[PDB]
Amino acid sequence: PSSRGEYVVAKLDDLINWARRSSLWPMTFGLACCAVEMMHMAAPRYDMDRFGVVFRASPRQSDVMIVAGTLTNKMAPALRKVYDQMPEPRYVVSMGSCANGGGYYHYSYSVVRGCDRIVPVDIYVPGCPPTAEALLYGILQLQKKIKREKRLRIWYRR
Amino acid sequence: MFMINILMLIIPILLAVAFLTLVERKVLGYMQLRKGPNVVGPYGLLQPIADAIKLFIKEPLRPATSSASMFILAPIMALGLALTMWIPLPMPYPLINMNLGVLFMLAMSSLAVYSILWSGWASNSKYALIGALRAVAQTISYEVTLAIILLSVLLMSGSFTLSTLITTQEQMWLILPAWPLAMMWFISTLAETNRAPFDLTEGESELVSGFNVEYAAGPFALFFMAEYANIIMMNIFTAILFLGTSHNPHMPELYTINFTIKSLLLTMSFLWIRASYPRFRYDQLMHLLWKNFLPLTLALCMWHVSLPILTSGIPPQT
Amino acid sequence: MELLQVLKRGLQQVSGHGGLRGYLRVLFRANDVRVGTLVGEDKYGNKYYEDNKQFFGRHRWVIYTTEMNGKNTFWDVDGSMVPPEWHRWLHCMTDDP
Amino acid sequence: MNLMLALLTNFTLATLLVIIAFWLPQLNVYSEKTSPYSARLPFSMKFFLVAITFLLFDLEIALLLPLPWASQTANLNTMLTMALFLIILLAVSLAYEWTQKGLEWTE
Amino acid sequence: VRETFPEATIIKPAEIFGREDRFLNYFANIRWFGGVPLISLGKKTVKQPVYIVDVTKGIINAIKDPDARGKTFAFVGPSRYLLFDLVQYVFAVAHRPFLPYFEISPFEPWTTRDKVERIHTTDKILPHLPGLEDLGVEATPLELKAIEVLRRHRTYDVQPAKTIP
Amino acid sequence: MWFEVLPGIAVMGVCLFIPGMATARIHRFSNGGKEKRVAHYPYQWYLMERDRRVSGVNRSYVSKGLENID
Amino acid sequence: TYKYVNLREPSMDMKSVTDRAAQTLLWTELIRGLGMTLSYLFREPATINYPFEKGPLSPRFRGEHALRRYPSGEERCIACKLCEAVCPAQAITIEAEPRADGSRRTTRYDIDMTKCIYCGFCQEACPVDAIVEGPNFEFSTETHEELLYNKEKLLNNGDKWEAEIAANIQADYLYR
Amino acid sequence: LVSNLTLNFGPQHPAAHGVLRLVMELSGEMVRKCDPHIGLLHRGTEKLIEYKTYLQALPYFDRLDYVSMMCNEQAYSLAVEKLLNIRPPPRAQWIRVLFGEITRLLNHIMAVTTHALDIGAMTPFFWMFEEREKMFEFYERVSGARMHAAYVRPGGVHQDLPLGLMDDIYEFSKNFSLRIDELEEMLTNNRIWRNRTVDIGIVTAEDALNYGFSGVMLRGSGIQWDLRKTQPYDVYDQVEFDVPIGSRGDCYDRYLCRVEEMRQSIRIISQCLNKMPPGEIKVDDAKVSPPKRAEMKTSMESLIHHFKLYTEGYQVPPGATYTAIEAPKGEFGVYLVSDGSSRPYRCKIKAPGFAHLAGLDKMSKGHMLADVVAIIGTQDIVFGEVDR
């Protein structure tokens, strides 16, 4: 057969992307209420595992961090610690108003006004709390975001 | 032709371990009123491939290991021993026909605690080691009753040849004459492989970090393959030991079918048990052995030495 | 006996989807091969089905169009492709398509 | 030869698989990291004594292993007495620990 | 640049050191793991390295300072070091033993033909060019901000290098 | 439904069936259509080495019968 | 009125003692626990096939915000700032002025959707049904800036979702 | 002090209660000292309430014990109503008991199942959240929100029950006792579960009262105390139910008490469905409760009261009250001080989990490290209310 380098890189990129989105093992900070809706996303009706998303993942095997609740100033150092220990590729999902931008404690002295002040965020899931279905939509949006990555294709043209 | 026959044993073992992970997630799901993997490939048939490709391209963790040598030995020792345990199993013919197959398997499994011990010592974290030490004491503890129970069974078989266990059960399964021993055997294979309600390594991770905390995705994935290889092998051994299939030398493949179905059903009973009970506390799984299983295993060992003599049913030596 | 009848339904699903090619397309696109009444179709191509003998929550569903607003959605579909008129019916906020 | 060729393959396959896993992923340049991070190991007698108890019981098992071959002897009364004697000794060793504050790991 | 954009501020730094640098991280890794230093007559090279933050500060003040336009700058560290001693000092910090005495490839060449030619070039002294002093930045010593850089390489009481007047 | 777990168990079953099936078939192929000879004890080894000389081709699975008695 | 959850006295006849001995040695209750899990394996899973199937909602569901219009097409909002005053999270920012035709209309209407708690007090307080919480719950974004809605966005949401919003109001306005 | 193990649940697991940093001294397997550090979900809620009207402050109470949303609302509403000197109408009192018991079921499913999940018994968690998911639909149908309903308000409830809700609640309640029975078929007589809970974290009756415990933590030790029976507050004097009482004060009795409370909640829910009376849902007094949207668009007085209620808010007479209810976790109380304006001067929240967690060190003495997981679970700690 005959094939260019550009074609080979495009197909290998699709393979690794398909594997990375098909097997997303999430770490979940269950900081507050939004953790309860994260638990409903694992329960029978939605069953995130059927997408390949394991119920429980350790911090140092995790692929995505889900920040489900209010990030207080006392807790912020610990969350950045966990984020650094995560091996790459690593993605953060910000779930709910509190994590997205402080929410209903935005004007508090003890609350970080959004977790994007601490860690980079890939997807923002609105709600207080987002419904289990709304979080599931967010995770499926992360899978499509990963599908569009072009790591190998960029590397070839460097 | 023998090199081929080895790769007709090694490669199929790895694939079975690959697809035991799918079967585990789906069986647990349906016992939990959910579907489990069913999106990646039809009925989740590509979930193992996605997980495998995902881990090996994952960025490695930082080894930060006290002993580099013992860091790389632990996964090699664990993976190599798990594959080696399969060479004497009669299905219906062993790859290597040993006259002391049972002692070879018993002796080899005793070396499997070095992988736990080395990785813990090479981890470089003080709580990781205390995790490894707790696990080792559990593994060697339940080896004691496995050896004595295995000794009791072999006093009705009359040999250490694994193919002689088939002949012993030609008329009837050893599950009848030895159901008190089959109960304690089956549990000890749960505790030997560190499975629920004995998976104290995973359950108490926050309290005491497990020994495999330090390895990267690729190396950690290899520790996990060796662990389900042992779980499949210990249920294949459970089937040969207590549920012996009849062998028709003209139709060996009929043995391999009936034999394989019995191996799966016990292997899926491991999943069944995981989904049904809470975990043991460490002092409780030590109480279960040293104070319940061991007294009964010794009493039944005394019984199974006396019984063949007082019924004139001593098996042949050959 | 019932086992044979069960298998008959399984085969009926293969013909109910227009043959093996039709039955495999829904299997890989939707991960589900049930068949139900076509309640309607909408101007973008989505098709809507119900089967009232299913349990509450599965008795309605949509098979998303393969293209919408100039984007190839054979594989890439998302819950935001349901238009507002059907959004009410699909989420059971109403009882009338 | 066949046992040797079987073992050599099983540990050669394991060695290649581990060597590929450890090193080959290192060729991917995932950025570069910052800095990761007193106490000692407090020796516990309970974890030691369980290891020893296994050692002593495990040896008494080594004497029990020939029992399947030992029932082919003409002198069955002698064999039967010494078999029950050794298993009963394994029982007395257990009873001594049980009744003299020994199974402390069991608690 | 000086012809296309005459009002441009051209900044000339020396080897810059920092957490993610490829200068001290180069001496700690490439020299150590799998190799013994490839130093080519290390006694003949004099180096004047500058901290990253001082360069960052210098660049900002060139934006906010209106006299910087049209001027070329030279950002240099407080001290001049001997390339041999520098490598030695790096090793002491990283607790890697130092004993005086890798092909380019795809991916990302780590150690290359030209990189060596540069690590050996001697830091030119151009007094007429203004430096960090003229932008309100004090050059920071290597010693302070070298334990910061090299604490990662260190496995699991240190003496400084000797400056060249 | 529960029976959607079977395809996974079927693939796992096919995987655990190949080892036994291949070993039996390979034994027949290398040993002239009969089971591989089992020699646990020295007497069984003596007979196998006797058969090896008897055949004349140096294979212990080549049986010689009354036709050679002459 | 109270009851004793665990004040039984176990019977000490031999028949009962043997029952507990049989239970202890034969693992009876543990087998019973295995039976219940076995029964669930043959029960139908409660999972639904998201996104092809959706969870049931009601007309009162509180989702994404939108600004509505009258049938003629004029905006319902008169810039009374009752929603801004009530908002528990201070998520709403309003400015107003007289429009070119002298009408009382806003020039700035903003909702910081990352401040909002999706409580629906603003729709309860609006006198003209101008601000509503729609039925959309699938609008997660990739950047924080995409969740700070100005007037145009909320007007566009009203134009986008009016068909459904009006029907939901029709279904619930009598309860309100 | 053989070793100090600083155990941070920072890398949280599937519990969702929050995050707890636990500092312990382990003299071997045993625990000699336990020291919870609890600032991680402190959000300044009590100070923020001072800048909000009474209506604006109500949603804060949904987000305290975020598994007892409508019970926290009722406590706030009962406190405010007491200062206002008004009375909610009889229909709303029945709706508030009805959803108070649907909330108790919601809380105990989380309490028992996540307690069992931490001790390795994962399956009942999935069995019961299919039920909580059906209960979340009742919340969404009356309020529009699955969790933070904001539905129970001073004066009554925001809206009336939609037509067809009571039938669906009855259908849920009819099949629910069987769901509890399946749960007991996996835990009540299970020897492994009993070994993990029996004679763990024993609390004496005398130490319970002095340490401030309430709820199941008292009744497990044999104290006959329930606020619904001794200080009834809505229609709880008009419904028959029994209080489960423990005898040994251990985790296993506390586990049994909660499972029996779920049965008594279904008993109560049955009576509420049959006795639901007709009428209005909020106090018919428009200087406190907003008028109907039809009247506000027709009547001048209604528009004025609507305008002022949603801007200034109703003013509350000066005074201070301590109101407590039998929340699912325990006694939930608010000390609310009014300066006479429309914004509270001080709102102190009494969380039952605050005292229980402070009593952890007492209970953990002389237990192994793996027991502490069981002790925290049996307390039913959520850090939304521990910290506020």
Ligand SMILES: CCCCCCCCCCCCCCCCCC(=O)OC[C@H](COP(=O)(O)OCCN)OC(=O)CCCCCCCCCCCCCCCCC
């Ligand atoms: C005529 C003379 C002939 C000689 C014999 C005559 C007498 C025969 C009658 C005696 C029968 C002996 C029974 C042997 C089984 C072992 C008994 C046993 O050890 O059970 C007790 C053990 C702990 O007891 P515990 O509940 O903690 O009580 C308090 C402590 N005193 O409880 C436990 O074991 C707990 C185990 C927990 C893990 C269980 C998880 C799996 C359960 C389901 C598996 C079902 C069985 C699987 C069978 C597999 C067979 C292949």
Ligand SMILES: C[C@H](CCC(=O)O)[C@H]1CC[C@H]2[C@@H]3[C@H](O)C[C@@H]4C[C@H](O)CC[C@]4(C)[C@H]3C[C@H](O)[C@]12C
């Ligand atoms: C290591 C193996 C890939 C090896 C191979 O197939 O060749 C992969 C395939 C599927 C994986 C497993 C499943 O995908 C997910 C399981 C769930 C928990 O996260 C524990 C790890 C978990 C048990 C995984 C362990 C390991 O990473 C697996 C087993």
Ligand code: SF4
């Ligand atoms: S966003 Fe809402 S539900 Fe989530 S933690 Fe904050 S207040 Fe609770």
Ligand code: SF4
């Ligand atoms: S829903 Fe509540 S928090 Fe959100 S904008 Fe409306 S009043 Fe403010």
Ligand code: SF4
């Ligand atoms: S949206 Fe309604 S309440 Fe808000 S300013 Fe406009 S008219 Fe007033």
